[PDB]
Structure 1
Amino acid sequence: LMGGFGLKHPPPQIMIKNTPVPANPPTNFSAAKFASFITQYSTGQVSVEIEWELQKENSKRWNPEIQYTSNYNKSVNVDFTVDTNGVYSEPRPIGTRYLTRNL
């Protein structure tokens, strides 16, 4: 009901964590659990490649259909673009429904 594709077997969950690295243990055995860990984090790269199937417009409609277009008028910032401070921004939500079909 928010939108999209209901799936019984959706793309799986990818889980990740940093393996614990203990700090120096005591020199006499104690069965208590370690609260002492080396503070660390990890970084890396992630790629996602999805293959989307398309359904083409077959319409016989004579007159021009609405399309999603960028405003031609000048502006301080360009839409869907970084600003002077490097911050990416999306000015408006874009739905997918423009082309028209008959019932």
Structure 2
Amino acid sequence: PSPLMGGFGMKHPPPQILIKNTPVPADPPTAFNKDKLNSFITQYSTGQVSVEIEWELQKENSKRWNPEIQYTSNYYKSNNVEFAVNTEGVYSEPRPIGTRYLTRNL
């Protein structure tokens, strides 16, 4: 049951976290009306969110003699730095990076 787009398949994954601004009615009429209130004060909210994940690693103990292939940046000069902001403040990711650079036997 490994997910086909990649990753870890779990029967009990991290739960969904749901959030909502509590409605605040505007001034109701001074005579009773049984219909649900339709007039509300315009509101929004802001805040900080933190997520901390501990990951377990599995180290390599290869006996390969020659050097491996490694992900690296290229020294050649360019207008911008890869994985940084440009002059207008926009961050970008210039390429997809996988995980398979070290090698193992079958």
Q: So what's the TM-score if we normalise by structure 2?
A: 0.96
Q: How many residues align?
A: 103
| Structure 1: tracts of 5 or more residues without a match | none
| Structure 2: tracts of 5 or more residues without a match | none
* Percent identity over paired residues: 85
Separation (CA, whole Å) in 2 of partners of 1:52 and 1:30: 56
Separation (CA, whole Å) in 1 of partners of 2:7 and 2:103: 20
Q: So what's the TM-score if we normalise by structure 1?
A: 0.99
How far 1:62 sits from its partner (Å)?
0.3
Identify the residue that residue 33 of structure 1 maps to in structure 2. 36
Identify the residue that residue 92 of structure 1 maps to in structure 2. 95
How far 1:100 sits from its partner (Å)?
0.2
Separation (CA, whole Å) in 2 of partners of 1:32 and 1:77: 59
For the pair 1:42 / 2:45, whether they are aligned, the reply is yes
Residue number among 62, 65, 72 corresponding to 2:65 in the alignment: 62
Separation (CA, whole Å) in 2 of partners of 1:8 and 1:61: 38
Deviating runs (4+, > 6 A) in structure 1?
none
Cα deviation 1:16-44 (Å, max 9, x = unaligned): 00000000000000001111000000000
Q: Which one-letter code corresponds to 1:45 in the other structure?
A: Q
Separation (CA, whole Å) in 2 of partners of 1:86 and 1:57: 39
Separation (CA, whole Å) in 2 of partners of 1:8 and 1:17: 27
**RMSD of aligned alpha carbons:** 0.3
